Amino acid sequence: PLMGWASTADPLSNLVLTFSTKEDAIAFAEKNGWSYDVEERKVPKPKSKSYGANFSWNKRTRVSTK
Amino acid sequence: KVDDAKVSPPKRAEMKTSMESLIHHFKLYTEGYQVPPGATYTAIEAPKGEFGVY
Amino acid sequence: KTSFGSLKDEDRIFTNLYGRHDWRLKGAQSRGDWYKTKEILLKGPDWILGEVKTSGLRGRGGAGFPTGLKWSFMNKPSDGRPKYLVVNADEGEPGTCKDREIIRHDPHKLVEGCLVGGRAMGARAAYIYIRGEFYNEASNLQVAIREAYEAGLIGKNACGSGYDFDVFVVRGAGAYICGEETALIESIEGKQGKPRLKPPFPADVGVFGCPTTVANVETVAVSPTICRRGGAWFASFGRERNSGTKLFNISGHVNNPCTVEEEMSVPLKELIEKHAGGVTGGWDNLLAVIPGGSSTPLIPKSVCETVLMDFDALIQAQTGLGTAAVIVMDRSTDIVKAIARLIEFYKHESCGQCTPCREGVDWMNKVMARFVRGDARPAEIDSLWEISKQIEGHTICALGDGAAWPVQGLIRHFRPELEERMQRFAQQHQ
Amino acid sequence: NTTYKNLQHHDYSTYTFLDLNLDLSKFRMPQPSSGRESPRH
Amino acid sequence: RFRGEHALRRYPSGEERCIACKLCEAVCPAQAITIEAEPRADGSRRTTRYDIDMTKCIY
Amino acid sequence: ALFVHRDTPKNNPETPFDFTPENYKRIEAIVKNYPEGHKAAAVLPVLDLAQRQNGWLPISAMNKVAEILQVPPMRVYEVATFYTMYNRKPVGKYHIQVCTTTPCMLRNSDSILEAIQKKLGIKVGETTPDKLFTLIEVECLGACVNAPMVQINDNYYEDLTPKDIEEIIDELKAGKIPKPGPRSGRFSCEPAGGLTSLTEPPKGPGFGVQAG
Amino acid sequence: SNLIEVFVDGQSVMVEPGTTVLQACEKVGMQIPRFCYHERLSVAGNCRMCLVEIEKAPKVVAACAMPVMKGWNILTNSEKTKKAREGVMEFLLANHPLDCPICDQGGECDLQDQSMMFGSDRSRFLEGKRAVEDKNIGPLVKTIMTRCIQCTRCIRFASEIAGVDDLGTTGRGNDMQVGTYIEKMFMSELSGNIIDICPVGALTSKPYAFTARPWETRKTESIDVMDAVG
């Protein structure tokens, strides 16, 4: 109420712990006591694209611009 | 300074007219240059003694 | 083997250079067209490909890819997708008039050759792309197509046998890039003229997705003559890799600048003076010689007095042979100014697919401006050398490469005029 | 032959290219279609 | 080249020299800079709040 | 050269613009050449018809071509802004293209540029305070083997000199048009020495061939 | 049974037929730097960044649109691969204006990150630096078209997902203005999704425009509303 800042009563608000595997993450979280929510890893899906398919003859995949 | 602009920031003339030096200035002061992994130690002679840093 | 080769009469592949006896299919029959072509067609396209590789046709337009390998890639077994033949007829490399003469005085041998190429590889229709600068010559081509149709001998069921073959004509809209190998293909497609990527070849995916190919007009013109004439009669004029006749033209600085057919090799001094008037001011007046046109490095005086006019010879001279502007230029013109105007041309006509040709021709245009005004340092001329090493081959097409090469030739040969120009600018400002 | 066998080019009017394309439209094999009539149908 | 008052500058007969490009708060090693930025009715990007904590400022 | 439209009426659709039914039959011949399934390939010949009908194309012409070929207009705007033969600025009857790059400028095009400039009056690239003299210098056209060249509406002029400049411009003022071909004799692209080309009447199909 | 052998600097891996060099290089972890390729769209090649020296070839070729013959070896860390990356990154920053303070992609540029990690340091090209004046595309999307690197990603996005066909290339050479020719305020669905497509600071959010720069703001998982898909 004097400067327009965001104070907090949260010492733990600026923790982050970058790990390398989900197993050690869950093991450390269960080791140190508190609860935890696991979201699963999502890779980009591999696709099938080609420039010749962008220059189709009777397929509708057509670049239409260039 | 060193002539390796990806570690030391360039000076003002090339900074105000470059492109690579402005980019290096910008990201070098925002992020900080990346440092390869590993553990080093060194020590020099402070007037007290072995000023070591690990 | 010939002693460097020259023109012997009636060994001209095509007569009627200009304004001769008539302009008609009857005149084509008198000059040697529509003669015994059905017996050539009904023997099998493998024999036509054997005849062409017997002649050993070097590909024209200043590329180097031989016609036999290309049309042997064109022997794919026919699927549900048809095959197309595209006759390219633009004239880049400013200084050209290569096939302007051919399409202005003899379209009939072009009709013969596109029929031969349509039979020889399984093609079905031929689109002929004329430059947009050529409305009157295009209408002459339309009159010739009307005459060939009105004979009732092409179109549907050609030569009396059950073989239809249609030919169309698409105009240009004015470009250098529409002459190239694949921007042609997409300019026919109605999209704006932009080259594709090369490892999908035009012989696999082409005009909308069909196995097509693109032939130069000189290849179309020479193609029925090799079919109707003997094997390797064409190949006896010059060396073994390159073989036959070519249009060597001086469009530029000589007295009576003009065009001559010759064989594959020629002594250059006989070529310049003993056929086309004389050099403006004598042989020792010219500063240098550019062969090829505009996608070729220069050749100075002490190199042009001795070097013969072969493709392998200009590979040995680190250049590339093209057509019709195998010209000299005088000391009275500044070659820096001439090459800078050529770089301005390169900026004015180039598409914007690739980043490096775009920005490299941008820097080279502004830097050649700063060289004509002379406001730089020698580190700048070596920087122009470094960027001309950077650009070359890192693009899609060869317009970036053909913008790299004149800068290369100017730096390899004419350093001292640049140094004196910059020294005179230092004397001017100081 | 040292006589200009052309001037057959000289009479060319500004419509003749489209005139020749107009008149030579017959014996046209059907320019093969592909699925839809257009990229957007 | 003494380091004192933390003053601002402005253009010759012109507006505020700052853009609010947040570099000073990105580098401020005690985070004493506090920038909240908004553009005004003109269109050039500017600020709302540019605060220096004189306690945290190590100079 | 101001590649955004910015209407300025005498533009600003709808400008009233329509063709001739004979030209509609030309349109049907044009989209009857190209195969079914790829109607969008005839954009450049239809737009060429629009230019040859009305000397420069307005934006309502591009809307018309888009509605005829049932395409979105943006491809028509791309093809209009991409090429060289289509001048979106209004021009006059005759159009002057002074071509000068590599043999043309190096064979002294600047005399022709000075002659055109101090004969016509208006500067290079600009237009004239009448019709029929829209002057631009241009890059290469192909017809290189002679003096630096002039293109007027589907016609060429080679082997120039400033008295020929005066003659051709005064006769386009009068309306009588000279030949597309070369000048100074040499009735085609000729070796203009002692006729170093072929002289004999060629035999053709008569002499020795093989497998024919 | 439908496999292709490539060596990524010696490390063998198998490639499905028809795919690209780039998907296999991203399969082994090597992110070849890219500007025009993006996996939600078709494959252009106009940014030229993905050049890589593939062996027994004097010419260095693109990796977003290369068919994969059997038995490659792909040299990513060679000499002239780095030289081509230095050259291309030096070409991009020539006609790009000094707007990295007043840009809105300071923390989230692509020229900045890839020109640190791949480019040169001492610039060149002393004079020049043309500029293209902006347009008015829509009051929801703030648009500066001097920073457009002409990469042809928004155009492919329009013509292949939006289907609206209002953005196009105009001109030749250096002068390629990308946009709508006719002073039309481009308003359609998913026009808010073009500010995430544009890799450089040329198409930013209009209402967000100048409130923060993205290192201060922390990122948090949540689920969408107002649509039943989330």
Ligand SMILES: Cc1cc2nc3c(=O)[nH]c(=O)nc-3n(C[C@H](O)[C@H](O)[C@H](O)COP(=O)(O)O)c2cc1C
């Ligand atoms: C930079 C460049 C410019 C070209 N200019 C022309 C041209 O003006 N006219 C033309 O017919 N072909 C032109 N081409 C294409 C070549 O002539 C090419 O060789 C042709 O497609 C096939 O010729 P060839 O089969 O006889 O080798 C050009 C190609 C390139 C790379």
Ligand code: SF4
């Ligand atoms: S090198 Fe230049 S002109 Fe050639 S395809 Fe690439 S962008 Fe187009």
Ligand code: SF4
């Ligand atoms: S935000 Fe900070 S670094 Fe940026 S202009 Fe303002 S005072 Fe300078």
Ligand code: SF4
């Ligand atoms: S506006 Fe952005 S996405 Fe579109 S071409 Fe330009 S840089 Fe690429």
Ligand code: SF4
């Ligand atoms: S997009 Fe351009 S102006 Fe913006 S941060 Fe990146 S390099 Fe700077």
Ligand code: FES
């Ligand atoms: S340069 Fe003038 S016509 Fe080719």
Ligand code: FES
């Ligand atoms: S990513 Fe392959 S060229 Fe843009």
